[PDB]
Design a protein around this ligand. Structure first.
Ligand SMILES: [Zn+2]
Ligand SMILES: [Zn+2]
Ligand SMILES: [Zn+2]
Ligand SMILES: [Zn+2]
Ligand SMILES: [Zn+2]
Lengths: 74, 102, 42, 101, 93, 108, 98, 83, 93, 107, 85, 95
DNA sequence: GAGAATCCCGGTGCCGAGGCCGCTCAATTGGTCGTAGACAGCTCTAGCACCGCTTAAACGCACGTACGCGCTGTCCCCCGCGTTTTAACCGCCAAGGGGATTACTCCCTAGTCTCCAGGCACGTGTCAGATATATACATCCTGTTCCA
DNA sequence: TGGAACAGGATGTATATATCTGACACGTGCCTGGAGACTAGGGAGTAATCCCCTTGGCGGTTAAAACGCGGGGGACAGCGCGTACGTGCGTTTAAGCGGTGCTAGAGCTGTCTACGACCAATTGAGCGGCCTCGGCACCGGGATTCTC
């Protein structure tokens, strides 16, 4: 199960994620492979911003899904 | 090398006279739009009533005709050297004018 | 009318919002959508 | 400004013209520095005068000097833009004509 | 004497787009100047085209080419579409 | 013979007849066609609608109800193609877009 | 010691305020007197509509603001934060006015 | 009427500083004021000469906002809002 | 078909100024383009002025004012002088 | 009567009649006055003579009996007023003026 | 009948860029100037050629002419002498 | 061998004294055709049109390099670098 | 944490934005007539594709050096603040200059016809000039020499 | 030991002659565009009148400009290093030249037809004037935010 994350710089990065994984793990590997601090990341999918305590299966995110990343400096 | 020349002064007097006053060039200033030379007093008195050259009637300036007139030491020395005696007559006149009114 | 979708980040904006709540991109005309080559991440 | 008439100038009478039948004699060095062209250092011919500084030059001399470069007056360093800043001087041409034929 | 302007048509368009918004006199004057300037630009381009091609008449083709030459990108594309639609409607009715 | 305006004929708000008269009287060509005023009016109306929509959005974003030259300037200078079209135009009472070089701004 | 702001903070505050504001920044009567004196050379006994001097002032301030933006860019390019006549001259020469 | 001499001193240092602040300038040297005065004088000379030429061709004695607009348009400084 | 150009008159003026100097074809083409550009600029300015003053005729006054608006300084002065001299010579006949 | 050209009448070398025809057919105004073409022809002749004289001067200076675009470019760019008039004009085969910044010179 | 043309900007060689810089009066050139110049030239050519092709297509022709190029350059403010007009 | 700079100065003088073109004609023609392919297919070109395009391009690049050199000297350097081009174009108003 | 700037809220006033009515002149509708151009046909030219040859120019590599890029230190010159002063601004009045409109008439330019010579396409002889060859002068650099 | 001065070899470059050559300048036929005469109708010059708006002056009221002070931050200069660029050489690539052939398409000519200018009658759209009530400038008071 892979996902695609698109940045505001036109960069699409492929991640190997499990549907049961929570977004905490998602941004964990985001920092691991990109160095983006957790507080600067906002996730957009299906016209809604993901809630902190929710996991992918709640949002019914399927294979080859594209999620948009927004960076806001803190 | 040119030689020493003696010439009639009536030959160049018409080309050395001042039209407005009829006398020799004293403090000669020239209008630069047409390059026409006159006595400073003559041209400054005329310029307060007209904005055109007395000779060729060309517009000297649109607003301030005094802005295009320049005093010419060249023709000054030309007259002082070509004609004899004006320098003595003139400085005697200034001294005898200043000898009574300080 | 109904909620309008953002062109830049696709997050659904309310009909009363004229700049995006996340990316603060001015809403475009009904015919011309706003472009992306305007600013950067920072 | 810088043109107000002085107490002498406002009422001075014209200098009477000398109409007597006398000749004038000039040496070839009487008018030397007054008639020397600053460029060629020779007797002036086809004289041209600048509008702003009223400095006389030989026509060919000033044309060549301006073409070469340094668009300022060779005598007073004041800038002149082109040939249009100069006027011919038939007065001086006639003067040198009778003076040294 | 009368002084013609585009104020009524600008107000009609404004009411069509934003039903609840007004416009001040200075803004209306800016709009009038903008319309006049654009009109002048397009007409000059069309006249130059017609003179270049040895033509004595200005047509919708010349106007379309002038619009393409002047307006950038998407503006030119949509303006051409609107002009073609208006011409087709006028010719049909 | 009921009179029907050409603007209503072509479904436009702009004065097709006035545009035709101005084209005729402007010394652009010896003669003008029939569709040229319609095309020009449609283009002018489209541009006006674009400008007015952007200005209205900008104005009511500020929570006012009147278009002002500041709103017009903001719309024009914030739309890229409109700014390219009006690069050499100065709008009275418009001001400038707020922008400060980051070098001048302190940071950490 | 009383309150003492470090240099620059008031500068950025003024920058923000004047970038938010839209009014004219030059005095009306001095600008009008300058305009009339400049116009004295071409014609004499001229008269001016008020809208004429208003348009002149608008154009003048717009031109000056654009020139100062270009000067600031030149100054930042030269690794400085202070604008200088060299920056002004370079901006004008590149623009093509000199 | 008065000779009206020495008027370009009325564009004051605070006004020049305000214009610079609107332009986004943080620090200003001491000679920028003289430089700005010279530049403004040149700009005004050009625009006024063009406008007065238009007015004189119109055979009037009053300079109009439309004449100023025409001069600016000829110079490439198109201005909106004054007709 | 014949194509008109100012080559003959350019050659006449060149022989008037420099009797023993010739001109190449590329230089002549450049001179022709220069003359066309100046003619177009002056004519456009005169037409704009005539439209501004609500006139239907282009006259020597419009030409003179356009020349003053376009040519800088001494060039404009000498051009005005030559134009007035030519006009008075033509009308005094 | 014998036909006398308007150019000869006004003492000009330029085609007054052709200028009048171009003014009439150029869509500039509804009517064209009689004295308008003479003025324009005289102005064009003066400008041509100015440039041609400068071009000839540069040509004979280089010892080239023939004017070339290089001579035209030198003449135009060496004069401030002509350069300002032709500021946005490119001359083919004209080259550039010889000019190097003093700071670039060897110390 | 042609299929596709590629890497024709490369034909603008580094020695040619150095020659242009020398005519401009440049004494010392960095390494990225070549790429920057290639991009700038590509943009300028794109604009001019687009305008010229628009003129040609309006003329209902299939050959781009020097008159079309001159008209495009004049429209862009780059008046060019020597090729007609 | 010469120190650096002498050959550069000689090249500057040589290329400022002459008026010939500095770009290879066939590569320039190929580039022009490739660029034109994106607008209309199967076009034809006149040799004069290609020559005019080349002249305009070279003049534009020469002017841009002059402005770049001015910027580089202003920044107290003798080497031209891409930010000088960027600043020159931004001030000219092309970007 | 003290202090100055600026957003947020609520009142108040006032003036101009928008709606309404009357008139008048300009856009509609209808018809005619002259010619601009849309289409078909033909010609010939110049744009494209190909060949081979020669050598000019681009490419790649190596080396030394000089110049761009921190880094530090100093000192001087804008910035921020308080106090004095000065003239900008606003409200008011008054006079007349000239911009804007109207009416009459006159003369100047468009349009038509006829005539004819000025300039353009075409053809051809000759010399200005690019190119080649050789030479002496101005630049440039490194190695050597004398003084500190 | 280095640093300023100088001599000699190498290289670019202007100068002096000879080649030959393709473009420049001149002569000719003719045909189309410019000149001479004449008419007529409207654009524009000229004179008179109205009243709108510009100029000039006055008196308060402050808002803003001018002047002086202390000090800290930024501009400038000197230093060191190591990295990127200029210079030179040898090799490889392909551009420029001269020639051939084919044909698509630009350019010119005849026709005939549909389209736009021009004129009349008219009637409704838009401009001028008026009037009113709500949106925004300014007022004051808290509350929040940014600096030092
Ligand atoms: Zn005179
Ligand atoms: Zn006298
Ligand atoms: Zn968004
Ligand atoms: Zn002098
Ligand atoms: Zn001399």
């Amino acid at each position: 199960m892979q996902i695609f994350v698109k940045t505001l710089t036109g960069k699409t990065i492929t991640l190997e994620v499990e549907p049961s994984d929570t977004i905490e793990n998602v941004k964990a590997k985001i920092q691991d492979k990109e160095g983006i601090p957790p507080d600067q990341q906002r996730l957009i999918f299906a016209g809604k911003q993901l809630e902190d305590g929710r996991t992918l299966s709640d949002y019914n995110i399927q294979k080859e899904s594209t999620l948009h990343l927004v960076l806001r400096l803190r | 090398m040119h030689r020493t020349t003696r010439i009639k002064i009536t030959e160049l007097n018409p080309h050395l006279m001042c039209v407005l006053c009829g006398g020799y060039f004293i403090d000669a200033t020239t209008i630069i739009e047409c390059l026409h030379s006159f006595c400073k007093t003559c041209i400054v008195r005329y310029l307060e009533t007209s904005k055109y050259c007395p000779i060729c009637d060309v517009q000297v300036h649109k607003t301030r005709p005094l802005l295009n007139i320049r005093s010419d030491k060249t023709l000054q020395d030309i007259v002082y050297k070509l004609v004899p005696g004006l320098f003595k007559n003139e400085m005697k006149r200034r001294r005898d004018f200043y000898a009574a009114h300080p | 009318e109904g909620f309008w979708d953002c062109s830049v980040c696709t997050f659904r904006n309310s009909a009363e919002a004229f700049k995006c709540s996340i990316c603060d991109v001015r809403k475009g005309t009904s015919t011309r959508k706003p472009r992306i080559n305007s600013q950067l991440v920072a | 400004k810088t043109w107000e008439l002085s107490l002498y100038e406002l009422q001075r009478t014209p200098q009477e013209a000398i109409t007597d039948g006398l000749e004038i004699v000039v040496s070839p060095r009487s008018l030397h520095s007054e008639l020397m062209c600053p460029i060629c250092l020779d007797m002036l011919k086809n004289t041209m005068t600048t509008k702003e500084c009223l400095h006389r030059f030989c026509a060919d001399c000033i044309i060549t000097a301006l073409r070469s470069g340094n668009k300022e007056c060779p005598t007073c360093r004041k800038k002149l833009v082109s040939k249009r800043s100069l006027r011919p001087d038939p007065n001086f041409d006639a003067l040198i004509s009778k003076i040294y034929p | 004497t009368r002084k013609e302007s585009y104020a009524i048509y600008v107000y009609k368009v404004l009411k069509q787009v934003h039903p609840d918004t007004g416009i001040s006199s200075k803004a209306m004057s800016i709009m009038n100047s903008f319309v006049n300037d654009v009109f002048e630009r397009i007409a000059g381009e069309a006249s130059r085209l017609a003179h270049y091609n040895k033509r004595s008449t200005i047509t919708s083709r010349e106007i379309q080419t002038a619009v393409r030459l002047l307006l950038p990108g998407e503006l030119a594309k949509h303006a051409v579409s609107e002009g073609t639609k208006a011409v087709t409607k006028y010719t049909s009715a | 013979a009921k009179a029907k305006t050409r603007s209503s004929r072509a479904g436009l708000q702009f004065p097709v007849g006035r545009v035709h008269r101005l084209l005729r009287k402007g010394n652009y060509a010896e003669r003008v066609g029939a569709g040229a005023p319609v095309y020009l009016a449609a283009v002018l109306e489209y541009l006006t609608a674009e400008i007015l929509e952007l200005a209205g959005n900008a104005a009511r974003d500020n929570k006012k109800t009147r278009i002002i030259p500041r709103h017009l300037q903001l719309a024009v200078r914030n739309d890229e193609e409109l700014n390219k079209l009006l690069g050499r135009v100065t709008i009275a009472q418009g001001g400038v877009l707020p922008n400060i070089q980051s070098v001048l701004l302190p940071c950490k | 010691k009383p309150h003492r702001y470090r240099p620059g903070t008031v500068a950025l505050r003024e920058i923000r305020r004047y970038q938010k504001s839209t009014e004219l920044l030059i005095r009306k009567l001095p600008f009008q007197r300058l305009v009339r004196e400049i116009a004295q050379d071409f014609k004499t006994d001229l008269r001016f509509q008020s809208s004429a001097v208003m348009a002149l002032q608008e154009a003048s301030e717009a031109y000056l603001v654009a020139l100062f933006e270009d000067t600031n860019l030149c100054a930042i390019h030269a690794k400085r934060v202070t604008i200088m006549p060299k920056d002004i001259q370079l901006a004008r020469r590149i623009r093509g006015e000199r | 009427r008065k000779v009206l001499r020495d008027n370009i001193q009325g564009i004051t240092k605070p006004a020049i500083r305000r214009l610079a602040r609107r332009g986004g300038v943080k620090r200003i040297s001491g000679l920028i004021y003289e430089e700005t005065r010279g530049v403004l004088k040149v700009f005004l000379e050009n625009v006024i000469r063009d406008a007065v030429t238009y007015t004189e061709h119109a055979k009037r004695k009053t300079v109009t906002a439309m004449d100023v607009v025409y001069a600016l348009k000829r110079q490439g400084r198109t201005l909106y809002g004054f007709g």
